[PDB]
């Protein structure tokens, strides 16, 4: 069987061992086009810790799964979630990793309304994250609210590195149709080799989401959302009349059809929109935790 071959290779890369020996009361907290995640008690301390759980028979492309335990291995960093463990459990694998209490930014952009102080901050701590990474040749190609964590304090993390790829001088471009398709670059959906600028498009995607609730062609299904994003100009904000100029400048960088003139994100980093960045203070009260009381 290529599963019980699959499984011998997964071994190969892991810890050894298993935490259920470690860990108490897994509760299911959502879950991802890859698998399902959990929040643990770690026994000994009462620590909590999230638990990514990922069936190997039920990927797209499973070999895609080592992904995880390139990021947890080699591109740990304070605005990526920390990655502690990988172990191959039954026809599983499971990483443990920091538990995000803050929990998605999607539930904040379906049930609120960010202001600027609040959208610089993400976008802030996500090009932060990304400078790093596309520095390394690391692409996320799966950035969405869904894939922004927080922390109870409201600080700022990318997760969900299943659908990630390096590129390097030996393999400068990747041609992979990946990520999801409303956030999808142009280039990419175009099937052009492309780079990190992909993840740049996705962001400006995100602050859409952050802006408007939903990113644009929500509403058509995703082949024909696809074909909209390649063929049309760059999508326009429902709620243009609503966002400073600088927001809009800002924006503007990210959503470039041409990947050769969108900007970086080593070069956003310094755009005068992000000097409105809050402190992560100014995210707490978004949190579902926090909004009713
Ligand atoms: C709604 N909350 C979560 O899903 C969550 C919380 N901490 N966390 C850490 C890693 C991953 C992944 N991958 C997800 C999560």
């Known amino acids: 069987s290529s599963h019980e071959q699959f499984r011998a290779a997964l071994q190969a890369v892991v810890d050894p061992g298993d935490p259920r020996s470690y860990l108490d009361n897994f509760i299911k907290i959502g879950e991802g086009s890859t698998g399902i995640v959990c929040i643990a008690t770690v026994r000994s301390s009462g620590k909590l810790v999230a638990v990514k759980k990922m069936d190997l028979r039920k990927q797209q492309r499973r070999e895609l799964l080592f992904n995880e335990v390139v990021i947890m291995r080699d591109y740990q960093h304070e605005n990526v979630v920390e990655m502690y463990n990988s172990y191959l459990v039954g026809d599983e ?43 390394q040749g690391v692409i996320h190609r799966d950035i969405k609210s869904d894939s922004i964590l927080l922390t109870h304090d409201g600080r700022v993390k990318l997760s969900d590195f299943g659908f ?29 080799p492309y780079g990190p600028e992909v993840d740049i498009w996705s962001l400006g995607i995100m602050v859409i989401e952050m802006v408007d609730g939903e990113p644009p062609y929500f509403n058509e299904p995703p082949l024909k959302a696809m074909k ?23 924006l503007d960088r990210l959503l470039v059809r041409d990947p050769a003139q969108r900007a970086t994100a080593a070069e956003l980093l310094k755009h005068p929109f992000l000097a409105k960045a809050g402190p992560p203070a100014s995210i707490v009260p978004l949190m579902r935790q926090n909004r009713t009381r």
């Open 93 to 135: 694998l499971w990483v443990v990793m920091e538990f995000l209490e803050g929990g998605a930014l999607t539930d904040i952009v379906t049930h609120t309304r960010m202001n600027e102080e609040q959208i610089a901050a993400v976008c802030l701590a996500v090009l932060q994250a990304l400078s790093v990474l596309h520095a």
């Open 164 to 192: 990630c790829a390096q590129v390097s001088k030996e393999v400068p471009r990747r041609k992979s149709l990946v990520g999801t398709p409303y956030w999808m670059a142009p280039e990419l959906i175009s099937r052009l």
């Open 228 to 250: 909209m994003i390649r063929d049309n100009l760059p999508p326009r904000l429902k709620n243009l009349h609503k966002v400073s100029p600088s927001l809009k400048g800002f």
